[PDB]
Amino acid sequence: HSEMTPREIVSELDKHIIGQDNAKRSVAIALRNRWRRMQLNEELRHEVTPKNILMIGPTGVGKTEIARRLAKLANAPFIKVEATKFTEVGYVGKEVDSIIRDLTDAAVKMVRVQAIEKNRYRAEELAEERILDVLIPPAKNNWGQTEQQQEPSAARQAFRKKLREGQLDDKEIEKQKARKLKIKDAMKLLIEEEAAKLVNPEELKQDAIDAVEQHGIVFIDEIDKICKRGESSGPDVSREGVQRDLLPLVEGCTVSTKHGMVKTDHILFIASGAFQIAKPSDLIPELQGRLPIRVELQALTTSDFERILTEPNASITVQYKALMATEGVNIEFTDSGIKRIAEAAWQVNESTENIGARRLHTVLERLMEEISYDASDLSGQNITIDADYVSKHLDALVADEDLSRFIL
Amino acid sequence: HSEMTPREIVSELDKHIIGQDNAKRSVAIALRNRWRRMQLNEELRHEVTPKNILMIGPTGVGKTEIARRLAKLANAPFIKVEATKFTEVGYVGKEVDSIIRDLTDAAVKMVRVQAIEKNRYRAEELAEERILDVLIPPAKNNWGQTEQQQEPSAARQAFRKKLREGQLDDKEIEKQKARKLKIKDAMKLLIEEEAAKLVNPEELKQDAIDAVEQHGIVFIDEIDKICKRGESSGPDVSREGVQRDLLPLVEGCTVSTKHGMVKTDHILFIASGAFQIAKPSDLIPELQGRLPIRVELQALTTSDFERILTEPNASITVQYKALMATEGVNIEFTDSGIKRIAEAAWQVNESTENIGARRLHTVLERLMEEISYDASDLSGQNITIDADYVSKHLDALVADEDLSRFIL
Amino acid sequence: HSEMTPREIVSELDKHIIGQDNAKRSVAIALRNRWRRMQLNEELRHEVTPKNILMIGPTGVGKTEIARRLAKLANAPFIKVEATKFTEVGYVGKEVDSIIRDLTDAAVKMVRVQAIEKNRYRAEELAEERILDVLIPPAKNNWGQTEQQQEPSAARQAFRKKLREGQLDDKEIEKQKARKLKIKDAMKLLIEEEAAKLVNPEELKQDAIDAVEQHGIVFIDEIDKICKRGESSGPDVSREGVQRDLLPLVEGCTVSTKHGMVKTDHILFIASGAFQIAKPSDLIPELQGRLPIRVELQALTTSDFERILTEPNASITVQYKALMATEGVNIEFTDSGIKRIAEAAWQVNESTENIGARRLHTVLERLMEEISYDASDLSGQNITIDADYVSKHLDALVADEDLSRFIL
Amino acid sequence: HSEMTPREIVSELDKHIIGQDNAKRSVAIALRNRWRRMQLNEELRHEVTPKNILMIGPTGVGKTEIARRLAKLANAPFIKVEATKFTEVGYVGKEVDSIIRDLTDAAVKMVRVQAIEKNRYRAEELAEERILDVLIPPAKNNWGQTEQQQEPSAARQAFRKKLREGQLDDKEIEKQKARKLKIKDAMKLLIEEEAAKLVNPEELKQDAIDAVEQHGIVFIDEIDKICKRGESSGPDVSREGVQRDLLPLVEGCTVSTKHGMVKTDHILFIASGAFQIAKPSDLIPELQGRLPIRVELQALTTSDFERILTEPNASITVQYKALMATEGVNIEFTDSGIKRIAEAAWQVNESTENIGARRLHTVLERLMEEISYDASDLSGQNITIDADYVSKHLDALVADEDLSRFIL
Numbered sequence A, B, C, D: 001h002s003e004m005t006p007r008e009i010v011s012e013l014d015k016h017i018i019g020q021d022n023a024k025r026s027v028a029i030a031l032r033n034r035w036r037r038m039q040l041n042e043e044l045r046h047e048v049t050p051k052n053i054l055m056i057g058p059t060g061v062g063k064t065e066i067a068r069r070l071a072k073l074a075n076a077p078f079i080k081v082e083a084t085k086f087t088e089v090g091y092v093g094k095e096v097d098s099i100i101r102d103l104t105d106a107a108v109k110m111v112r113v114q115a116i117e118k119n120r121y122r123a124e125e126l127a128e129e130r131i132l133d134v135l136i137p138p139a140k141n142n143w144g145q146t147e148q149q150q151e152p153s154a155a156r157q158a159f160r161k162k163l164r165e166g167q168l169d170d171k172e173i174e175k176q177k178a179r180k181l182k183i184k185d186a187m188k189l190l191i192e193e194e195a196a197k198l199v200n201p202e203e204l205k206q207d208a209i210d211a212v213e214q215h216g217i218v219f220i221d222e223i224d225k226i227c228k229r230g231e232s233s234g235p236d237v238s239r240e241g242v243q244r245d246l247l248p249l250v251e252g253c254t255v256s257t258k259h260g261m262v263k264t265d266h267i268l269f270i271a272s273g274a275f276q277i278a279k280p281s282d283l284i285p286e287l288q289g290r291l292p293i294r295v296e297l298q299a300l301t302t303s304d305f306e307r308i309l310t311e312p313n314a315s316i317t318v319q320y321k322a323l324m325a326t327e328g329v330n331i332e333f334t335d336s337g338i339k340r341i342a343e344a345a346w347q348v349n350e351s352t353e354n355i356g357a358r359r360l361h362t363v364l365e366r367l368m369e370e371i372s373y374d375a376s377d378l379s380g381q382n383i384t385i386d387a388d389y390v391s392k393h394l395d396a397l398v399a400d401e402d403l404s405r406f407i408l
Ligand SMILES: Nc1ncnc2c1ncn2[C@@H]1O[C@H](COP(=O)(O)OP(=O)(O)O)[C@@H](O)[C@H]1O
Pocket: A016, A017, A018, A019, A020, A058, A059, A060, A061, A062, A063, A064, A065, A066, A308, A312, A356, A357, A358, B286, B289
């Protein structure tokens, strides 16, 4: 669908993710290729398959975010499954087809919600005519001057201009309705009333299929957790089982959805792993073939942290400012304030367990717990969060390790 | 929906839970944020997600209560699931999606019950017109004077006024009815019919969805029992598995309910643990990221006990009084009688197994077993529960340990 | 159905698979026999059963391809199942009948898609008459002159000729429609309606059955992994169990599909194995009897690699060129550039894990990652991939072993 | 149904099976007994139950073939299940009722297909009248001389005689049809069209039940694999479990089929085993009682092999000749040619694993792989397969043992 060049894709992706430029270009090549395909002929359109990607890197450094924004950027159906979620089906559990079902149930919960956007002006234009008709019951067979029913639009325009807020005047209209009711009701009873007339069935639900098959993006987290490890063997075939089970999906097959028959042949797959215990080559042969693209993602640095805090559109910091503005409070972060928030986050990840950028949300959130509570009783104030404040609120916590495993 | 400042929320929570102010603050900021979000713009509303909380504290000190009163204070759908439930799914178990289904089913049994409220008034106000139309069959063509019909409001009035109690008189009215059933019964049958035709079936079930999606509150109890421990390895896999399974729910996804397709991106999660064996930093990194808020709850003291006994609204001590009054017995606890009831509870908890505040219920019940039975034959009396009475009924039991593990 | 002599089949297969002539001959005799049978008499048609084949050979050398191109050459339904899948059924697993169900479901999604072909022409040829009948409403009672109607084929012609592109103009036509939707849309909506009423629903699904029963091709991958081994005993039971489970399918039986009752007596089975651990004589005797044909496939050499790279139809090298042309870039591989690409692939397979021809895809993709991204900004250019370019992009990676287990 | 004497049964069975005369008479007594029963009175018809048989012998020597031909000879519903197929249901798997279901789904896939045979002359006689009616639209209310609509049968007989191949003349006829179409279509659209009018529901599906209950034949392979063995105990009750599970079926009970309620009381059961590890007496008491008939089958000899190659009706050799005739090639086997084919088969079974007569299909098939391929380019030739040819094609293979475990 998108006609964006890889470079334009990476650009757009730079608005949400800091660094990880390589994974960006990989994911960008994949998107542009879907365009490149449709510009081909009959034959080559069956042969050319998605160049699936294997993202390699430590926790919370942007693997899923990149895939999520890529998906969101091409208005593509997106699903994220954890590979181990199937390592238990040998005793019972979700079958792997579920992935294509869900990427269909949400690929529908998408086309449906995005049919309320398109059909939101129809019920409040060619449908608000319901109330204005029981306010000024149109002439006994309107005359006909293509401006005759545009004439009132005086007697009419008055009932519309006044319908800019003034209501609660109970009347009635029309299984159509008939029943006597109120406008804060016989108006809202129309909101949905006249809208289901425009949205059909065998096209809306028929298109979800079209979407999944053409633009579906499946993100398989922890693919490395289903590779063979040298600690046992019984659980290995269990793991390797999930690999074989996943095989039909990325090799090309047909799954049964309660919305139709979906073909996975062109669904793009972004697998993901840390690969500390296993290596991509421990993945079965058939899967390595279907995972042509390998891209590495680096661990985040303190500078990466500072940037993540503020650069992304609607960055945690920006959102915080917004939310406090809700309470009528003007919150503001100084450069050194951020530098320390990032510093704290790095400290805890290094002194305890590393969870990547995640750590920033908890640190940032703990730092603000006080303003967040008192916000309402501070309205009309300019609160500045600077190095000082940051230090007074986080030092003790970060400093105390056992406490960090609980509170930070 | 609520417009209560965090501080206002805590106050309303103070009416039910003693102490644990920090946990109140935490849970209150969470609520307030759901409001703060709707005040944002198109973009920032997709970005800002719930600030899930992880409550850390010993058993029976107010964790579930706090959360339950939070949801009950926001008329939000609330589900409490025991995390370990899904451990055995590795062999065969309830899917984790079940959590969002059940959230939905009780969220339906909710919007549906609270539908019987609005349709309980106008449900039997138009239900009268039915029985009256056969006690004073209206004129052949009413005369539009908007008062020429409210005329009986003479003959009519008498039947309505005599229908304020003196009914039970057979009749016949109207798939409508056309049967000949008593008015006590026509009245009853009418409660239904008129009520139902007054309920929008579609919007009903479509609202339960809106609820779960917008105000859903999931309480995952003992999440700490699905963290990794140094005792074995096989369990840890399934243990951690349940974390991976829960992951999509708290990260954002779509589940299939039999009442529709529900999205979890904005359900608020309150996880809970004791954390004596594991530490919050033992949860998988993707989960720690989704639990930005950490709050500890302190163990209850004896003062806490004394207060929990009488201070809350509908406190168990107040409940007992109410229940005894039902029997015509005036029950009164003295300050020392309560100081001693609490004292006893603390004693069994230190003496044997510490079950937190739960212990007050059993001690209090053992103490009243006597009155509770005789109540009826004690009507019109002023029984007083003081230190003497208390000590006479609990001391022997409390002092005897083995007997305590059975009887209290 | 096909009337191709075995030799003709092999030729058509030579267009996609390099070498492995023996396996081609084997699979070609199988097809030819399905014809040879229909030439027999009533009796001899029940007797003669498919000559199932057992392909023996290392990974990624052309086994599945051969079989896939065989079915695709006979427009036959084709399913590929990994035999070990059913191992875990001993604890809980997909039934083996699932193979014939899935064969049927993709065989349905097949006869159904190939229905959209014939109903894509006359589907929108009679779909025009619809839009035209509202641009030139036909006379009140056409005049049977079989040309007096093709008269407009004047006024009519103009709208048809102006409907060859210049449409998008609103209209209204006819559960039919009776709505007022744009012609770009009436046209679209018409594609469906006229197409559907043109599809015999019963014979559709009844044909998928006919297909599976008459031309079904089941490919049971890694059957050798369900043979008995001298390592344990418990698994062997389930292992062999899967053989007993498969037995009725390849011996002749009836399975229940949700689209009807399918019989397997004439599905052709192509089993596959590496057979390093077990030997074909390790399959249970009832199964060896049903696999009358045994053919070995040799490992691929570097010449094989070089050829596989450019020789097939829509070979990956040709595909890349096509894809790059989509970006306006002329890509050309020199003889030595290809000799070196193949060389590299063979090197990683000897150096690390030998994944057969699959390796060409990853090496080729790593090699083009650079061009692939820049393509757009390289439009109108003649990029040439020669030994130099190749060596500059692969040598370092290929030479570094550990890096190969990740990146290639 | 059949009125054949046991001797006539064995005779008819001799047309397909070589040797194994005893198993023949056993299976023949069983069939004749079903006739003997219906010739009895009310009482004795409930009491007399099938004399179930236990066939004892080595692989591929005629156990199933005998049972298959017996079934086929009495047009009885036949099902073959592998006993171990249920030894896994203790962890999950097919329930034993499935056997009676399948023996119903195929016992239906039988009555249905054999309703297309009976109703194949009805649509091409009293239904081809559809096309001849739109070719010569019958008189306005045919007169009536019992030879009046037999009169045309000139104008009529001409349209029928010419309808012996000449068509493709699009017309139309009549949810009946109406729609304009073609004869290679409006003729075929009639083939099934007028035929569903003769076949009813509650008799066709009602009779399948009647069949299974009266003539059902269940063949339970490897019954010995579910007897107790002295290697373990846990899996024993698992095996012995399948015995108990099978008990209701051969003792008399009711199973639920989606076609009706089937009674197994008169289904004939032919169990089968090798009994090398266990003995029939290791079968549980109740099952030995229900398996009154015990018959042994001998291993096949080289002479048995020579005879099997050529005597049976539609013997592999005969079929081969037929199939090559399809290619216009005259294949012919000399007595010594066969003697050697059999010899080779015996050799391999003795030098490696014995798989009985199965071995002949693989040897025979390998021997012909060349003629089978070149058949089309040899048309009009008399190819003789004699001792020489046989030797040149099989010697090397049979001689090389490891190769035989793969290729033969
Ligand atoms: N490079 C990055 N740029 C911006 N945000 C990031 C980055 N890395 C991690 N994050 C933040 O941390 C969280 C971690 O999840 P995610 O980014 O999906 O990575 P992973 O898939 O490795 O866990 C995300 O919510 C995201 O907002």
